[PDB]
Structure 1
């Protein structure tokens, strides 16, 4: 039954049991149900009024904290002779690059949420003059819009694209992107192929495509070079989640897929996820006095 649960369940006192035909510790795992054996059935209990709150395990609280999704460093310099991110970069938006957020999200099959984005920028002098207070432009370039080819291309005039202009001395730039799947939920996993032909990508729902984040320095280059690093954080909010999954055990290999190899030896080897003990009779950290 669906019910409102704010605290852990109370324990009732229980007596001795000796009833024929009543056998609450016996179960049948083959049904696929979990054991319904209560502690009051397994042992004699006392009454316990339980006050422990359950708010910290809410899916909202579990997922709605800001995580790094993108980090890029580029040279802020005169690029006339470079081969390179020439005072700007383009990022194809994804959540698979940083394993801590990736593993948390992949505990679920379908997710619906809005994304709070924070952009943190940092600058160092290339191998000192002090640090300049640069202006940056982040521009969202949706599917089928033209991405900028140059720091000063006219794409940056941004007539209809969302842009945010922000300083390095400011607090980190912050915006919310709405839930923008063409379905009612994002497909965290996708057992399918993106195209009507056979050559399309496995494992990525086309319905979930966000677009590109294009970031430039707005200033003309200075006489000396700098490295600029941009960090993007995403925080899910107003979250719905469906069909929880076995967590990732093996190290990730790629952002394109669930391909797996494991560590050379346990823990998280393909052959052994838990580290070995000497025998099933060995207690590894046994208390001895």
Structure 2
């Protein structure tokens, strides 16, 4: 039954028992229920009035932290001879590339959230002259819209795409993207295929497609080359979460799938998640005096 829980539960004092037919420490794991044995039933307890808050494990607080989702470096230079990100890049938006954010999200089967996006830009001179205060354009290109082909192509005129223009000397650029799934929640895992034929992608719900992020430098090239790094941070907010999952144990291999190998030896090997001890009777950090 649903109830409002702001603090951890109190403990009541308890007496000696010795009641026939009452065995609160016995349980039946086969039912699939977790043990209902209370501490007051296992031991004699005192009264404790418990004031510890539980707000820091709220799902909103657990997930609504800004985390790196994308990082791209490209040369800001005259590109006429290059073969390369020619003062712009395109990124196909995903949550799977950086493992710390990926593992937290993959604790759940379904998520509904709005995404707070922070864009941080940094510049370095190619191997010094000072650093230019460049203007950047980020443009969101939804599904079926055309991506830019050049730094100066007319796609950047952004008649109906959302664009943000920001300087390097500004605070990081920030926007919110709404929850935009064609379903009521994102499918964090998808035991299915994307297309009506048999060759479609396994494991990616088509319903969750966000689109492309296109970032250009708006300035014409200078006489000298710079390296520009763009970092994108996502913070989920207004979160609903359904069906908690076993956490990832083996290292991630791919953004595209759940494939696994394990580490070569424990911990987090395929044959042994926990590191070994000499025996089930060995206490590894035993206090001795």
What is the TM-score when the length of structure 2 is the normalising length?
Answer: 1.00
Extract unaligned runs of 5+ from structure 1.
Answer: none
Aligned residues: 289
Determine the C-alpha separation between the residues in 1 that align with 2:45 and 2:7.
19
Shift of 1:48: 0.1
Shift of 1:13: 0.0
Shift of 1:188: 0.1
Determine the C-alpha separation between the residues in 2 that align with 1:199 and 1:63.
34
Determine the C-alpha separation between the residues in 2 that align with 1:241 and 1:97.
21
Indicate the SS of the match to 1:109: strand
Determine the C-alpha separation between the residues in 1 that align with 2:228 and 2:144.
28
Shift of 1:30: 0.1
| Residue equivalent to 1:251 | 251
Spell out, residue by residue over 1:223-264, the C-alpha distance to the aligned partner (whole angstroms, 9 max, x if none): 000000000000000000000000000000000000000000
Determine the C-alpha separation between the residues in 2 that align with 1:256 and 1:118.
24
Spell out, residue by residue over 1:11-47, the C-alpha distance to the aligned partner (whole angstroms, 9 max, x if none): 0000000000000000000000000000000000000
Determine the C-alpha separation between the residues in 2 that align with 1:119 and 1:234.
9
Indicate the SS of the match to 1:228: strand
- How do 1:1-289 and structure 2 match up within 5 A? 1-289=1-289
Spell out, residue by residue over 1:175-227, the C-alpha distance to the aligned partner (whole angstroms, 9 max, x if none): 00000000000000000000000000000000000000000000000000000
Determine the C-alpha separation between the residues in 2 that align with 1:111 and 1:81.
46
Shift of 1:66: 0.1
After TM superposition, the runs of 4+ consecutive aligned structure 1 residues lying more than 2 A away are: none
Determine the C-alpha separation between the residues in 1 that align with 2:63 and 2:257.
22
What is the TM-score when the length of structure 1 is the normalising length?
Answer: 1.00
Determine the C-alpha separation between the residues in 1 that align with 2:274 and 2:29.
24
Indicate the SS of the match to 1:243: strand
Spell out, residue by residue over 1:98-128, the C-alpha distance to the aligned partner (whole angstroms, 9 max, x if none): 0000000000000000000000000000000
Shift of 1:68: 0.1
